[PDB]
Ligand binder design. Sequence first.
Ligand SMILES: O=c1ccn([C@H]2C[C@H](O)[C@@H](COP(=O)(O)OP(=O)(O)OP(=O)(O)O)O2)c(=O)[nH]1
Ligand SMILES: O=c1ccn([C@H]2C[C@H](O)[C@@H](COP(=O)(O)OP(=O)(O)OP(=O)(O)O)O2)c(=O)[nH]1
Ligand SMILES: [Zn+2]
Ligand SMILES: [Zn+2]
Lengths: 397, 399
Amino acid sequence: VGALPIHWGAPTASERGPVVGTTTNRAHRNVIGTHSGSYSIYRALAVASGALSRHHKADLTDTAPTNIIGPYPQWSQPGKIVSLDPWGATVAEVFAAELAAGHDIRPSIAVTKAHVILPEVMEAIQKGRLHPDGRFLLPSGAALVTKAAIEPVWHLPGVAERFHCSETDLRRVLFEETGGMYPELVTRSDLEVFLPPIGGQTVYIFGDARDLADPGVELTARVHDECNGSDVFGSDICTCRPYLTHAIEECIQGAQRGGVGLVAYSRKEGRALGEVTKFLVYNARKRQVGGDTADQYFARTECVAGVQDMRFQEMMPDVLHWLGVRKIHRLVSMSNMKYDAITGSGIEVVERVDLPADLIPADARVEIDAKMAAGYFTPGAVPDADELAKVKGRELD
Amino acid sequence: GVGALPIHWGAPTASERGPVVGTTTNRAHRNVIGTHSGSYSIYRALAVASGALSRHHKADLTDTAPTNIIGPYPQWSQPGKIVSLDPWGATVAEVFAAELAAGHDIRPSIAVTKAHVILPEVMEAIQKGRLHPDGRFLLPSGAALVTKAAIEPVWHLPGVAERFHCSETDLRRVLFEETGGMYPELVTRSDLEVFLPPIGGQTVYIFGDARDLADPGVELTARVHDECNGSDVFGSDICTCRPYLTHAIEECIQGAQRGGVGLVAYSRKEGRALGEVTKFLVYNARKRQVGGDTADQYFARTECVAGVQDMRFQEMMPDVLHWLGVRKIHRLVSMSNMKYDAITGSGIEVVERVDLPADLIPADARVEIDAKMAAGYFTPGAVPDADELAKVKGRELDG
Ligand SMILES: O=c1ccn([C@H]2C[C@H](O)[C@@H](COP(=O)(O)OP(=O)(O)OP(=O)(O)O)O2)c(=O)[nH]1
Ligand SMILES: O=c1ccn([C@H]2C[C@H](O)[C@@H](COP(=O)(O)OP(=O)(O)OP(=O)(O)O)O2)c(=O)[nH]1
Ligand SMILES: [Zn+2]
Ligand SMILES: [Zn+2]
């Protein structure tokens, strides 16, 4: 009849206990916050307008994962996974008794399958770079994938340790810097788990999810942070979608050669500054005295945002650990921030696959040159001060 | 010091309206619930906790101003017309220059810039002769020249409540309860009317001249598209989303080329605003149910998981149109009766409705679009019957 305890990192589901973040019975709630990231606000609108009963509980029939992921040892190693719930995809199975007992437990992960058709993959086929095999890649250009949507679930003591500050400071600052969101951050130190109203990520798996846990199977992977204006709209000011679709191409070939491929797509728009800040910086970049130069790229963000980047890649490897990933043979990525995080978490990276020069869009030179000067991996020449001062950016029109 | 500046929502001028002060550098100046950047205030907090970002930092807005002048328009002050974004949010540096100088730390909630967008479907449209570069709107590279505006949410709680035909205090209590107590000020600070929710906003892509949006004598082609990452980015063939998005973009480019103007609004409402986890759960149940993935079961599968078919509440979606001065949409590249009802209900005339051509429906999206048509989505001709909707049109899992 009371709220179930949570022992983060315990080796069984029973011992770990379920994340109860629903609101149908507040005496059962054992976390701060609520499911579905931002979309709790829309659920509130649906309740307030009469469309949805505040008493509704999901019918989870037939929703269970299409592919079995874990459990793996990483799920129970202390401090290893702190920003998602390793049991979040299998709650209907591992918490069946708690559900029947009356605890309204929602999945925070869902696993299904798809056929993804990307125009860049269809072109890769037309140009003889890819050849359909009928298993991973079809003649239509469709790739067969497993995909997993993963919503955030933060163990605040683990997150604090991840960031080298005390938990009470992390929680106080979370409370203050959001204008006082969730006073239980400072008022309920007994609650260790937080469901923030932020986007999560989506994992695309090419081949067998279980091979992600076998470091003897060659793994091609990219962690991609959302860039809507490119990932969807193809703006030529940045490398994002070209890098994403190049990685997808490489992942398909990886699977075809008998390995496995992984793309994680994490919702951190604009370096987790959001899109308004991102567009303000573009304007400042193009209007500054001297033109849009690579040697001012980072400074223009700094002046608006007070920081260069807020993605905190130190939590990004949790999804890899959830998947059992223990080694990445081909990391399709250049960022030294991502590379240090992944390898700093124990995961070997064998080959770093930089973005081929011919995929850089017409107004993305400023970005990629600044990034290589800042330490992003490249096999070739790093731009020196003189090359960074070239006005490589297009004028405002 | 000075107290918090009052806010008179929908006042005739920026000065009378008052700035949205949602920063945290000075708590005494805050005059709203919440903070800027939607979801991304959580990351800002992390940056401050880690010591990477000073809690005293304030934006240098030098050179950030809109690339295109949007408004002001009468709709910015019509009662209850715009309740989910701040019409002054793009121009705070100009219209609240005084208050900034009096020490009120005021951030934009809107940014307006320009871009060259290069979509593969547009390149292919050129190869097939559906589109022809003109050098001004569409380049031979396939790049289209656009103005784009990122709009983050700013809610006037009394106006939002009215829009939903419920009392303001009921709306605010339910927002508080159903989020697990997100912002107690919702129930504790009835004097604060304005709420900055931690949700995504939208991005408007304008083909041609933004000022023409306010001129109903200029032919407007428009789509309001709700985010579907798994299609809009990854092209899953279960749904129509990216085909509809890129079809609309093609139509907007052409509209601008003929002397008109185009608009695509891209709103962050993943999975009918249920989010992506619920969306994937429903796909699984669709494909495993007795009798297979059929269109007459499509909406039932969502209701069983989510308790509703849809949470996007299109009732707030026309606000951006009114912000842009749109009074008439000559070609609405959309089918949803929910969107159409909200748009016309809000006073915007719609002339032609442009359905998704049959040949752009992906291989496993037949279930979706048939169910939508049978549910009342616009279609130029016949709607499917009880039979037809009962055909197992959906691919099996793995499949
Ligand atoms: O000028 C820019 C440059 C980058 N981004 C954002 C988008 C996202 O937050 C990330 C997109 O790409 P990716 O996910 O692949 O990250 P990265 O740091 O560029 O590393 P790499 O591509 O080497 O993996 O950068 C901007 O908003 N404005
Ligand atoms: O099976 C589905 C069907 C739809 N969506 C969501 C995604 C988003 O919430 C919207 C996709 O794009 P759009 O913005 O164009 O909405 P629509 O209702 O289909 O109306 P129309 O396309 O006719 O304008 O529907 C799902 O999550 N699963
Ligand atoms: Zn980008
Ligand atoms: Zn879709």
